[PDB]
Design a protein around this motif. Structure first.
Motif, PDB file in Angstrom:
ATOM      1  N   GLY B  53      41.599   7.047  18.073  1.00  0.00           N
ATOM      2  CA  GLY B  53      40.364   6.704  17.401  1.00  0.00           C
ATOM      3  C   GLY B  53      40.058   5.222  17.396  1.00  0.00           C
ATOM      4  N   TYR B  97      42.453   2.382  12.561  1.00  0.00           N
ATOM      5  CA  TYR B  97      41.805   2.669  11.288  1.00  0.00           C
ATOM      6  C   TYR B  97      41.980   4.109  10.825  1.00  0.00           C
ATOM      7  CZ  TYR B  97      39.276  -1.771  11.166  1.00  0.00           C
ATOM      8  OH  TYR B  97      38.939  -3.101  11.097  1.00  0.00           O
ATOM      9  N   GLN B  98      41.849   5.072  11.730  1.00  0.00           N
ATOM     10  CA  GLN B  98      41.728   6.465  11.328  1.00  0.00           C
ATOM     11  C   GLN B  98      43.036   7.002  10.760  1.00  0.00           C
ATOM     12  OE1 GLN B  98      38.380   7.636  14.720  1.00  0.00           O
ATOM     13  NE2 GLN B  98      40.259   8.833  14.481  1.00  0.00           N
ATOM     14  N   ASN B  99      42.908   8.020   9.915  1.00  0.00           N
ATOM     15  CA  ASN B  99      44.014   8.603   9.167  1.00  0.00           C
ATOM     16  C   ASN B  99      44.370   9.987   9.695  1.00  0.00           C
ATOM     17  OD1 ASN B  99      44.940   6.974   6.586  1.00  0.00           O
ATOM     18  ND2 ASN B  99      42.742   6.620   6.840  1.00  0.00           N
ATOM     19  N   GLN B 100      44.373  10.141  11.011  1.00  0.00           N
ATOM     20  CA  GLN B 100      44.576  11.444  11.620  1.00  0.00           C
ATOM     21  C   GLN B 100      46.060  11.745  11.812  1.00  0.00           C
ATOM     22  OE1 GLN B 100      41.865  10.639  15.021  1.00  0.00           O
ATOM     23  NE2 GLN B 100      43.750  10.206  16.156  1.00  0.00           N
TER      24      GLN B 100
END
Lengths: 104, 299, 290, 207, 104, 290, 100, 104, 52
Positions: B53, B97-100
């Motif tokens: 991401g 950044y993303q919280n995947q």
């Protein structure tokens, strides 16, 4: 070093395998009429094999059937000579011929 | 020779990673040998590689190269005659950044595939009792789109491992970012630790200038006597391939035209369709270079 | 690297590839800084002389190889299995083989545990499941060996003679072994090859020693190796007792070789002779020399 | 530092060859026809030891030189030969490193030329004759001793066990000393079949 | 290195499992008429096995049967030749075969 | 540098340029920090006295030269060949030459492997193909040598005399060697040169000693150095056994020289004499001493 | 370009053949390769249409170190190597400075 | 190296024996009858040189072996002999170490 | 070092190869009529070769 010499190198021999020196490893500038040969030798000075390379405009190619290189043992000496037109032969690569194969 | 000619600088060989993405795959995934599709030369990500991401713009992405060197000293020489590079360590870091799931798996060095959300979707990701040494396969591919002819320049790292994790500060005005550093190890199956590659129509334009292979000077074409059928069927269309002397397909780059559209109608991609029996001339041009083919059409 | 491949065959027949292509497939890899591995340890003797000390000869020493391995796996249970297998591959009483394969062929060293191994880190090894084992092995025979060359000569005649081709391509002298059937009178070469170790280097150039007459069933092993007795009868007879202060004294010196003659006489049912020539080297790899 | 550089006192040397293995071997340097011009013929039809000759698959006349050089001018060459056809076999003495100038003894076998000659070489494969020719029939297993004596400046050939010279010559114009101490063999046949060829060869310094 | 030499390598074998060399690692340009030949031999030199690979435009694939590879023990030598059309065989890889299986 | 050249000539006759012009052409260069290479090791002796310890003498010691070389090449196969050749250039039993060439000339030191070489780095040497070999060699004869100065005098007379100019330009005493033909009674000089080692420096200023009457064919070599028996006959006869317990006692001390007289008597054929003066030095290079 | 990439990766990319669509892949070597080059650092000062060419000749240079490169969506990718000069035996110097 | 060097085994030998010194010498090893079975006889009554023979104080037959061996199979022996009385004198060539088998 | 002196240099010889010293190694300004010659001697000083 006032006078240049050859380069020390190694050749690989294998039973049942064609002995080949690619032309991109012997790239150069060779005018038409340039010859090249390769001589194998034992420790006493006797010739174990003499071959002539295919000299093209910008490369020299060596290719021998396994039968020809069968008798050259592991540890023999080799010299490679290039004879430019109307000039004496000069040694480019001298060295040793190892046999990279399964030993019995 | 003047200074400009001696310098022979080309600005087009400066590639700016205008966009960039990082794709991680589990170590069981087959490594990416190349990102160029064998069909049409487009970008082909192998299955199993998932993107992470977005990541921070200001931090960018830093590729660190570290050399371990050893100077060889000669008895009769004051300076070192040679130096030996024992190893070259490659790492890369970025602030994502993303919280995947894959991002959090990388951060916590744990496999969260068995994490089942609660009745209302909540999840809890416990850190492992002992940190787990997990390897991944990384693709860092960036795009520089100039004149609608993108250049995809990419780094393939068949084996990467989390080496360190930067401290994260929570600020009521900034989103939470995870900033890992990943070290690349040499993969025995593919025989390298890091590889760099280029692809795209822009790179196809710039191959000869960059100096890989030989310059494009002769524009050869597929056999110049193809037989096509007016009636609909297997042989109602025929595809033509435009190649350079350096073994590069220039069909997308060249322009397909038909001098006699009545006989064989040519499309942009290079497909001639039989419309009326006879003979047609098909010409594909690129700059000064051109190729021609005489197509036979049968009713 | 693909130019060098190190393997271990344990005393139980287990096969480990510690370095080279296929290293770590069995879970054990080889760590750097391995000592007394390449050159055979030789010490030289010196006696006082007019200008300091004078060379008095050399003695080869047994090898003390101190190296280290990594036993590794992702799960502690399988790591424990691998560690146990590695420990099982070694002993003190019986020796395990250590092969080095390069472009000069494959040469092996027989090594045994000199003392107990030093395993694991400071904490319990099940945490990392990737732990080093420090091995202090010893080579009683310090020379790297190859498979010995064996020749067979069988005959049905009462009197016969043959020529065994023999050649020492290694850098150290080797000791020949003969296996002679009975009955019959055998004459075996003991050529010095120019060795002055008994001040008869050229007097013994074509020396042949006649073994005692063998009675039926008295098959003999005649090993010139100083480690073992020269004449050994398979049936326990004292064949050396009827041999009158004669012996095989000379090894096959490096770079020397010829067609050594073996003669058999007074053999009613013929006879068979087996010649074993060892191939000892001081290095894991070395180009042929002559 | 050396007052004078003196050539080392090289001792008498001896060499043997029997042609039992597969190929010729590096101890025989081919000449004239280049590398790969020599071969071994089994002669199993007459039940004899293998001999050395030209490789008749692609050659007819071939010369070989011993790799090493004699250490003294006087030399003895003992050759055991076979006569399985017609041809010429040359034992070459006092040759240079290229077999350009040499003395030699030639055994010719044929319908009317069962003879022996003394020859002086002009190149490895071309030669001229000196003196007359002595009649000589050669059978399988015949042993000939060619001795060059430096003190008398003579070349002689003896047959079998008798010490009387079967052929002799003296005063021939061939350079001697260092650089002219190479020995060798040569074979010249009109057909592509073995003629007279050696199964055993020995060389020795001095006479 | 002036000549083309084989690469030292090891082949894993398992009892009751099918021997297979995936094509994605034996890559290279193989013109039509190319063949591959994998030879398994012992210490003496006796031929334990001969196998023919199925070459493609860019890969060489090997796939045998456990019955076929049962007779080959650990430590047996192997060599993999590739023969281009109108050319002599060339040894791509030589080396040794190890067994990854429960030892008995 | 171009002011200093270092060479090795192995036991097999191979030529290596370790340092100087053309160094590394054979693949092996010399690393810094080589020890016991320049000055010949000498220990001095002291005996208790009223004012401490009194001088008791000096003894020269053998050289223990520990030096490192670097064997390098672009490809590992050729590096392995280079390393094998370097190893083959050495031995324990036989010595190899180590030549130092400067503006003072060329001086050589004969060295042999004191112990096994220590090759390579911690990892396998094929990774780098550029590895150091630590060699611990020893010089049993610790002095650096130049080619000896030789003079020949021939006479057809029954009785004759000659004078040989001799001068030690080095810094260490040298021992003369004579080669005298037979038959004939020779008288050779054994001048003290003022050497008070026997407390006879001035008494033996013109000392001459008569060799025993040599019989036909008994040409002798008379080597005054202590490593060697003085009189040795060519035909194996015991000349020193006949010579009644005499000996040559004095070396040619540094800085001394004269026209030493050689006398020949009772030689019906007329004989020949050869004098060999060695050129020993304690350093690889040094300006001539006067 | 090819010489820049070869210097950066310590590899000889002369045998790299572009794919059917021009794409290339440059793999880093198994072990870094110690390669030496010859360098000419020539600069020109244009003064009154009478240029001064001041140059440095380094007959033997080797890649000593390579700094970290940062990818930013507003900057092109640059490779910043450090090259160390060694003394060449044939010419007898490591660095020379000249004017013309 | 093998071109320049000459091995001791590959060198012709030349041996002489005179017995004019009236001692056996270290080059003759007695065979069969053991140590001290040889002797030198002056033959001073006639104008003749001393000759080697059996130690007639102890034995009537004896044998001696030249301490060193020849380097090639073909051999030449030249003996100048004296017929003092009745007896049999053997010249022995191609003998083994203990002179068990030989031509003569 | 007040006087001009030679530089200690080595030569390379190969059997079957043409001995050659390139011109760019022996540089310097040489007026017309300048003659160069190379002399090879042995350990005793005896000349064993001379080339122009």
């Amino acid at each position: 070093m006032l006078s240049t010499g050859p380069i020390m190198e190694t050749l690989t021999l294998t039973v049942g395998s064609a002995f080949e020196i690619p032309g991109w490893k012997l790239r150069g500038e060779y005018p038409a009429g340039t010859t090249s040969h390769l001589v194998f030798t034992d420790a006493a000075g006797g010739t174990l094999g003499e071959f002539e390379g295919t000299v093209s405009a910008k490369e020299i190619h060596y290719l021998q059937a396994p039968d020809d290189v069968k008798n050259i043992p592991h540890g023999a000496n080799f010299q490679l000579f290039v004879t430019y037109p109307s000039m004496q032969p000069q040694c480019l690569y001298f060295g040793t011929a190892i046999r990279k194969e399964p030993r019995y | 020779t003047d200074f400009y000619t001696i310098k022979d600088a080309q600005a087009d060989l400066a590639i700016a990673p205008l966009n960039l993405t990082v794709l991680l795959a589990p170590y069981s995934t087959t490594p990416a040998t190349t990102l160029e599709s064998p069909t049409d030369g487009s970008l082909a990500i192998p299955p199993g590689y998932k993107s992470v991401g977005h990541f921070e713009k200001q931090a960018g992405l830093t590729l660190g190269n570290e050399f371990d060197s050893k100077d060889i000293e000669a008895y009769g020489e004051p300076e070192p005659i040679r130096t030996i590079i024992n190893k070259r360590t490659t790492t890369f870091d970025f602030a994502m950044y993303q919280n995947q799931r894959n991002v959090l798996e990388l951060i916590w060095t744990q496999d969260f595939s068995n994490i089942q959300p609660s009745e209302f979707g909540g999840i809890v990701l416990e850190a492992p009792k002992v940190p787990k040494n997990i390897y991944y396969r990384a693709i860092l591919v960036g795009m520089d789109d100039r004149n609608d002819r993108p250049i995809w320049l990419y780094w393939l790292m068949p084996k990467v491992k989390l080496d360190k994790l930067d401290n994260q500060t929570l600020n009521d005005d900034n989103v939470i970012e995870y900033k890992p550093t990943l070290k690349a190890f040499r993969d025995d199956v593919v025989g390298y630790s890091v590889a760099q590659g280029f692809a795209g129509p822009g790179w196809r334009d710039l191959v000869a200038t960059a100096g890989f292979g030989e310059a494009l000077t002769a524009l050869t074409i597929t056999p110049g006597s193809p037989t096509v059928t007016v009636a609909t069927g297997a042989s109602h269309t025929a595809q033509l391939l435009v190649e350079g002397d350096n073994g590069i397909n220039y069909t997308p780059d060249v322009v397909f035209t038909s001098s006699a559209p009545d006989k064989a109608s040519v499309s942009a991609a290079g497909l001639v369709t039989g419309v009326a029996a006879g003979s047609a001339t098909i010409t594909a041009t690129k700059g000064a270079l051109t190729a021609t083919a005489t197509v036979t059409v049968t009713a | 690297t693909d130019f060098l491949k190190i393997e271990l065959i344990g005393r139980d027949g287990s096969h480990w590839v510690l370095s080279g292509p296929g290293m770590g497939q069995q879970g054990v890899t080889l760590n750097p800084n391995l000592q007394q591995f390449y050159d055979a340890p030789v010490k030289t003797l010196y006696v006082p002389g007019p200008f300091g000390e004078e060379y008095a000869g050399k003695r080869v020493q047994r090898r003390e190889i101190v190296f280290s391995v990594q036993a590794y796996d992702e799960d502690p249970d399988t790591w424990s299995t691998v560690d146990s297998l590695w420990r099982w591959a070694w002993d003190y009483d019986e020796e395990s083989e250590l092969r080095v394969s390069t472009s000069d062929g494959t040469r092996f060293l027989k090594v045994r545990l000199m003392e107990e191994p030093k395993p694991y880190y400071e904490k319990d090894p099940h945490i990392t499941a990737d732990n080093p084992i420090v091995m202090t092995v010893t080579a009683t025979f310090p020379y790297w060996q190859d498979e010995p060359e064996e020749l067979i000569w069988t005959t049905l005649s009462t009197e016969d003679m043959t020529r065994f081709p023999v050649r020492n391509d290694g850098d150290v002298p080797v000791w020949l072994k003969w296996t002679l059937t009975a009955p019959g009178l055998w004459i075996l070469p003991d050529f010095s090859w120019g060795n002055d170790m008994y001040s008869r280097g050229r007097e013994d150039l074509g020396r042949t020693v006649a073994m005692p007459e063998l009675v039926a069933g008295e098959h003999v092993s005649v090993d010139s190796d100083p480690r073992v007795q020269t004449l050994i009868a398979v049936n326990g007879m004292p064949t050396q007792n009827r041999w009158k202060g004669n012996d095989l004294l000379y090894p096959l010196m490096p770079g020397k070789g010829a067609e050594i003659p073996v003669q058999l006489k007074n053999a009613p049912e013929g006879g068979a002779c087996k010649l074993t020539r060892p191939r000892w080297y001081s290095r894991p790899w070395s180009r042929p020399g002559v | 530092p050396l007052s004078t550089v003196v050539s080392p006192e090289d001792s008498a040397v001896q060499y043997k060859a029997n042609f039992v293995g597969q190929y010729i071997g590096p101890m025989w340097k081919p000449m004239g026809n280049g590398w790969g011009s020599l071969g071994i013929h089994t002669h199993a039809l007459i039940s004899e030891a293998p001999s050395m000759g030209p490789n008749y698959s692609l050659f007819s006349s071939a010369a070989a030189r011993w790799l090493w050089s004699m250490n003294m001018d006087s030399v003895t060459i003992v050759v055991r030969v076979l006569n399985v056809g017609a041809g010429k076999f040359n034992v070459i003495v006092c040759a240079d490193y290229q077999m350009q100038t040499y003395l030699g003894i030639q055994f010719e076998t044929g319908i009317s030329n069962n003879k022996v000659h003394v020859i002086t070489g002009d190149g490895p494969l071309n030669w001229g004759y000196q003196g007359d020719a002595v009649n000589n029939t050669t059978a399988n297993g015949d042993v000939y001793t060619i001795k060059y004596n430096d003190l008398l400046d003579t070349i002689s050939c003896y047959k079998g066990t008798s010490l009387t010279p079967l052929i002799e010559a003296s005063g021939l114009d061939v350079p001697h000393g260092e650089g002219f101490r190479y020995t060798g063999l040569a074979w010249n046949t009109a057909l592509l079949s073995p003629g007279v060829e050696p199964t055993a060869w020995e060389a020795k310094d001095g006479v």
